Amino acid sequence: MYRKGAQAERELIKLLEKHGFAVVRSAGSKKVDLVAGNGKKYLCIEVKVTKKDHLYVGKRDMGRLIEFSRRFGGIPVLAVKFLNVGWRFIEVSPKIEKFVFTPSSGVSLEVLLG
Amino acid sequence: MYRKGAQAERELIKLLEKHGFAVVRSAGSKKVDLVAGNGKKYLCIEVKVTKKDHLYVGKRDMGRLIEFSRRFGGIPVLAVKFLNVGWRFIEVSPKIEKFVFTPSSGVSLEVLLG
Protein backbone atom coordinates (compact mmCIF):
# COMPACT_ATOMS: atom_id res chain seq x y z
CA MET A 1 0.00 0.00 0.00
CA TYR A 2 0.97 3.70 -0.04
CA ARG A 3 0.31 5.63 -3.25
CA LYS A 4 3.01 7.57 -5.05
CA GLY A 5 1.44 10.74 -3.64
CA ALA A 6 1.81 9.47 -0.06
CA GLN A 7 3.86 12.47 1.09
CA ALA A 8 1.26 15.03 -0.03
CA GLU A 9 -1.49 13.03 1.73
CA ARG A 10 0.46 13.08 5.02
CA GLU A 11 0.84 16.86 4.81
CA LEU A 12 -2.90 17.33 4.32
CA ILE A 13 -3.73 14.98 7.20
CA LYS A 14 -1.63 17.27 9.40
CA LEU A 15 -3.38 20.43 8.20
CA LEU A 16 -6.80 18.91 8.86
CA GLU A 17 -5.79 17.53 12.25
CA LYS A 18 -4.39 20.98 13.06
CA HIS A 19 -7.97 22.24 12.65
CA GLY A 20 -9.65 19.84 15.07
CA PHE A 21 -10.43 17.02 12.64
CA ALA A 22 -9.81 13.30 13.13
CA VAL A 23 -8.49 11.75 9.92
CA VAL A 24 -7.61 8.34 8.50
CA ARG A 25 -5.84 7.49 5.26
CA SER A 26 -7.15 4.52 3.28
CA ALA A 27 -4.95 1.42 3.10
CA GLY A 28 -6.59 0.26 -0.12
CA SER A 29 -6.92 2.32 -3.29
CA LYS A 30 -10.48 1.64 -4.42
CA LYS A 31 -12.25 4.17 -2.19
CA VAL A 32 -11.03 7.69 -1.38
CA ASP A 33 -7.60 8.78 -0.11
CA LEU A 34 -8.77 10.34 3.16
CA VAL A 35 -11.87 10.47 5.34
CA ALA A 36 -12.20 13.22 7.96
CA GLY A 37 -14.72 14.29 10.58
CA ASN A 38 -15.03 16.74 13.47
CA GLY A 39 -18.47 15.93 14.86
CA LYS A 40 -20.30 18.41 12.60
CA LYS A 41 -18.80 18.21 9.12
CA TYR A 42 -17.68 15.03 7.34
CA LEU A 43 -15.19 15.04 4.43
CA CYS A 44 -14.27 12.35 1.84
CA ILE A 45 -11.10 13.43 0.04
CA GLU A 46 -9.14 12.66 -3.12
CA VAL A 47 -5.65 14.18 -3.04
CA LYS A 48 -3.71 15.62 -5.98
CA VAL A 49 -0.65 17.83 -6.48
CA THR A 50 0.48 19.82 -9.51
CA LYS A 51 3.00 22.42 -10.67
CA LYS A 52 0.71 23.96 -13.30
CA ASP A 53 -2.16 26.38 -12.70
CA HIS A 54 -4.76 23.89 -13.95
CA LEU A 55 -5.34 20.16 -13.57
CA TYR A 56 -7.29 17.48 -15.40
CA VAL A 57 -8.87 14.65 -13.40
CA GLY A 58 -10.46 11.52 -14.85
CA LYS A 59 -14.19 10.77 -14.66
CA ARG A 60 -13.61 7.31 -13.17
CA ASP A 61 -11.82 8.70 -10.12
CA MET A 62 -14.28 11.53 -9.58
CA GLY A 63 -17.30 9.29 -10.12
CA ARG A 64 -15.90 6.97 -7.44
CA LEU A 65 -15.41 9.85 -4.99
CA ILE A 66 -18.99 11.08 -5.45
CA GLU A 67 -20.66 7.67 -5.14
CA PHE A 68 -18.63 6.98 -1.99
CA SER A 69 -19.26 10.36 -0.34
CA ARG A 70 -22.97 10.16 -1.14
CA ARG A 71 -23.39 6.80 0.55
CA PHE A 72 -21.06 7.65 3.44
CA GLY A 73 -22.63 10.98 4.37
CA GLY A 74 -19.67 13.21 3.63
CA ILE A 75 -18.81 16.04 1.26
CA PRO A 76 -17.03 14.90 -1.94
CA VAL A 77 -13.83 16.97 -1.95
CA LEU A 78 -10.95 17.15 -4.40
CA ALA A 79 -7.89 18.64 -2.68
CA VAL A 80 -5.32 20.10 -5.05
CA LYS A 81 -1.92 21.39 -4.02
CA PHE A 82 -0.95 23.84 -6.74
CA LEU A 83 2.79 24.14 -6.10
CA ASN A 84 2.67 27.93 -6.02
CA VAL A 85 -0.71 29.16 -4.79
CA GLY A 86 -1.41 26.50 -2.17
CA TRP A 87 -4.11 24.00 -1.25
CA ARG A 88 -7.46 24.49 -2.97
CA PHE A 89 -10.57 22.50 -2.07
CA ILE A 90 -13.28 21.76 -4.61
CA GLU A 91 -16.61 20.13 -3.81
CA VAL A 92 -17.37 18.11 -6.94
CA SER A 93 -20.83 17.40 -8.36
CA PRO A 94 -22.13 14.51 -10.49
CA LYS A 95 -23.52 17.18 -12.83
CA ILE A 96 -19.97 17.90 -13.99
CA GLU A 97 -19.01 16.50 -17.42
CA LYS A 98 -15.26 17.19 -17.54
CA PHE A 99 -13.30 17.47 -14.30
CA VAL A 100 -10.69 20.10 -15.05
CA PHE A 101 -9.97 22.87 -12.54
CA THR A 102 -8.03 25.99 -11.56
CA PRO A 103 -7.67 27.44 -8.04
CA SER A 104 -10.67 29.78 -8.45
CA SER A 105 -12.76 26.61 -8.76
CA GLY A 106 -12.07 25.95 -5.10
CA VAL A 107 -11.67 27.64 -1.73
CA SER A 108 -9.12 27.72 1.11
CA LEU A 109 -9.04 25.24 4.00
CA GLU A 110 -10.45 27.87 6.34
CA VAL A 111 -13.22 28.95 3.97
CA LEU A 112 -14.11 25.26 3.67
CA LEU A 113 -15.28 25.74 7.28
CA GLY A 114 -18.81 24.80 6.26
CA MET B 1 3.49 -2.27 7.75
CA TYR B 2 0.52 -4.64 7.37
CA ARG B 3 -1.47 -5.64 10.45
CA LYS B 4 -2.48 -9.07 11.69
CA GLY B 5 -6.13 -9.70 10.93
CA ALA B 6 -6.14 -7.67 7.71
CA GLN B 7 -8.15 -10.59 6.29
CA ALA B 8 -10.79 -10.19 9.02
CA GLU B 9 -10.90 -6.45 8.35
CA ARG B 10 -11.62 -6.97 4.65
CA GLU B 11 -14.28 -9.47 5.66
CA LEU B 12 -16.01 -7.01 7.98
CA ILE B 13 -15.90 -4.32 5.29
CA LYS B 14 -17.99 -6.50 2.96
CA LEU B 15 -20.53 -7.24 5.70
CA LEU B 16 -20.97 -3.53 6.41
CA GLU B 17 -21.30 -2.68 2.74
CA LYS B 18 -24.11 -5.24 2.52
CA HIS B 19 -26.01 -2.97 4.91
CA GLY B 20 -25.54 0.27 2.99
CA PHE B 21 -22.35 1.55 4.60
CA ALA B 22 -19.38 3.13 2.83
CA VAL B 23 -16.16 2.01 4.58
CA VAL B 24 -12.39 2.54 4.48
CA ARG B 25 -9.51 0.68 6.16
CA SER B 26 -6.76 2.80 7.85
CA ALA B 27 -3.21 2.77 6.44
CA GLY B 28 -1.55 3.75 9.69
CA SER B 29 -2.26 1.75 12.83
CA LYS B 30 -2.42 4.68 15.25
CA LYS B 31 -6.12 5.60 14.83
CA VAL B 32 -8.93 3.05 14.39
CA ASP B 33 -8.95 0.09 11.99
CA LEU B 34 -12.15 0.94 10.08
CA VAL B 35 -14.30 4.07 9.58
CA ALA B 36 -17.85 3.71 8.23
CA GLY B 37 -20.91 5.81 7.37
CA ASN B 38 -24.37 5.34 5.83
CA GLY B 39 -25.75 8.87 5.72
CA LYS B 40 -27.16 8.96 9.26
CA LYS B 41 -24.86 6.80 11.36
CA TYR B 42 -21.06 6.91 11.61
CA LEU B 43 -18.86 4.12 13.04
CA CYS B 44 -15.18 4.10 14.09
CA ILE B 45 -14.13 0.47 14.56
CA GLU B 46 -11.41 -1.55 16.35
CA VAL B 47 -11.05 -5.04 14.84
CA LYS B 48 -9.95 -8.12 16.80
CA VAL B 49 -9.64 -11.85 16.03
CA THR B 50 -9.31 -14.77 18.46
CA LYS B 51 -9.34 -18.58 18.53
CA LYS B 52 -10.52 -18.52 22.14
CA ASP B 53 -14.05 -18.09 23.49
CA HIS B 54 -13.12 -14.84 25.28
CA LEU B 55 -10.78 -11.85 24.78
CA TYR B 56 -9.25 -9.35 27.19
CA VAL B 57 -9.29 -5.85 25.68
CA GLY B 58 -6.82 -3.35 27.12
CA LYS B 59 -7.05 0.23 28.40
CA ARG B 60 -4.70 1.61 25.73
CA ASP B 61 -6.72 0.42 22.74
CA MET B 62 -10.09 1.45 24.18
CA GLY B 63 -8.81 4.90 25.16
CA ARG B 64 -7.42 5.32 21.64
CA LEU B 65 -10.76 4.18 20.17
CA ILE B 66 -12.96 6.41 22.35
CA GLU B 67 -10.83 9.53 21.83
CA PHE B 68 -10.68 9.23 18.05
CA SER B 69 -14.41 8.50 17.83
CA ARG B 70 -15.18 11.52 20.00
CA ARG B 71 -13.22 13.90 17.78
CA PHE B 72 -14.43 12.34 14.53
CA GLY B 73 -18.04 12.26 15.64
CA GLY B 74 -18.75 8.57 15.28
CA ILE B 75 -19.86 5.68 17.49
CA PRO B 76 -16.88 3.87 19.06
CA VAL B 77 -17.21 0.18 18.22
CA LEU B 78 -15.23 -2.94 19.14
CA ALA B 79 -15.62 -5.79 16.65
CA VAL B 80 -14.38 -9.28 17.48
CA LYS B 81 -14.35 -12.29 15.20
CA PHE B 82 -14.60 -15.34 17.45
CA LEU B 83 -13.54 -18.26 15.28
CA ASN B 84 -16.09 -21.10 15.26
CA VAL B 85 -18.91 -18.77 16.32
CA GLY B 86 -18.80 -15.53 14.35
CA TRP B 87 -18.63 -11.75 14.73
CA ARG B 88 -19.80 -9.89 17.84
CA PHE B 89 -20.04 -6.15 18.47
CA ILE B 90 -20.40 -3.69 21.33
CA GLU B 91 -20.70 0.08 21.34
CA VAL B 92 -18.06 1.07 23.90
CA SER B 93 -19.00 3.66 26.51
CA PRO B 94 -16.44 6.31 27.54
CA LYS B 95 -16.96 5.12 31.12
CA ILE B 96 -15.32 1.73 30.50
CA GLU B 97 -11.60 1.22 29.94
CA LYS B 98 -10.95 -2.53 30.11
CA PHE B 99 -12.95 -5.75 29.88
CA VAL B 100 -13.15 -9.39 28.87
CA PHE B 101 -15.36 -9.80 25.81
CA THR B 102 -17.44 -12.91 25.11
CA PRO B 103 -19.76 -13.71 22.20
CA SER B 104 -22.84 -13.31 24.43
CA SER B 105 -21.77 -10.03 26.02
CA GLY B 106 -21.88 -8.60 22.50
CA VAL B 107 -24.46 -8.21 19.74
CA SER B 108 -24.88 -9.26 16.11
CA LEU B 109 -24.24 -6.84 13.27
CA GLU B 110 -28.01 -6.60 12.77
CA VAL B 111 -28.75 -5.45 16.32
CA LEU B 112 -25.81 -3.05 16.52
CA LEU B 113 -27.46 -1.51 13.45
CA GLY B 114 -31.08 -2.55 12.97
Curated annotation (Swiss-Prot), chains A, B:
Instruction: Provide the site residues for: Transition state stabilizer.
Output: 48
Activity regulation, free text = Cleavage inhibited by RadB in the absence (but not presence) of ATP.
**Catalysed reactions listed for this entry:** Endonucleolytic cleavage at a junction such as a reciprocal single-stranded crossover between two homologous DNA duplexes (Holliday junction)
Report the outcome of residue 89 to A.
Answer: Wild-type HJ cleavage
Keywords of the record, alphabetical order, are: DNA damage, DNA recombination, DNA repair, DNA-binding, Endonuclease, Hydrolase, Magnesium, Metal-binding, Nuclease
- The EC number(s) this enzyme carries: 3.1.21.10
Q: Please give a single GO biological process term from the UniProt record.
A: DNA recombination
Changing residue 21 to A has the effect of: Wild-type HJ cleavage
InterPro entries listed in its UniProt record:
Hjc, Hjc_arc, Restrct_endonuc-II-like, tRNA_endonuc-like_dom_sf
| SUPFAM superfamilies reported for this sequence | Restriction endonuclease-like
Q: Does the keyword Hydrolase apply?
A: yes
Q: Where is the active site?
A: 29
Sites where the protein binds Mg(2+): 9, 33, 46
Quote the record's cofactor note.
Divalent cations, Mg(2+) has higher activity than Mn(2+).
* Cofactor(s) demanded: Mg(2+); Mn(2+)
- Which Pfam families does this entry report, sorted A to Z? Hjc
Class in the EC hierarchy, top level:
hydrolase
What temperature notes does the entry carry? Optimum temperature is 70-75 degrees Celsius, enzyme is fully active after 16 hours at 90 degrees Celsius.
Q: Any idea which GO molecular function terms this record carries?
A: crossover junction DNA endonuclease activity; DNA binding; magnesium ion binding
Q: Which HAMAP family match?
A: HJ_Resolv_Hjc
The UniProt family comment states:
Belongs to the Holliday junction resolvase Hjc family.
Q: What does this protein do?
A: A structure-specific endonuclease that resolves Holliday junction (HJ) intermediates during genetic recombination. Cleaves 4-way DNA junctions introducing paired nicks in opposing strands, leaving a 5'-terminal phosphate and a 3'-terminal hydroxyl group that are subsequently ligated to produce recombinant products. Cleaves both mobile and immobile junctions. Binds 4-way junction DNA, a synthetic Hj, binding is not competed by dsDNA.
Q: How does it assemble?
A: Homodimer. Probably interacts with PCNA and RadB.
Instruction: Give the protein's recorded name.
Output: Crossover junction endodeoxyribonuclease Hjc
| Gene assigned in the entry | hjc
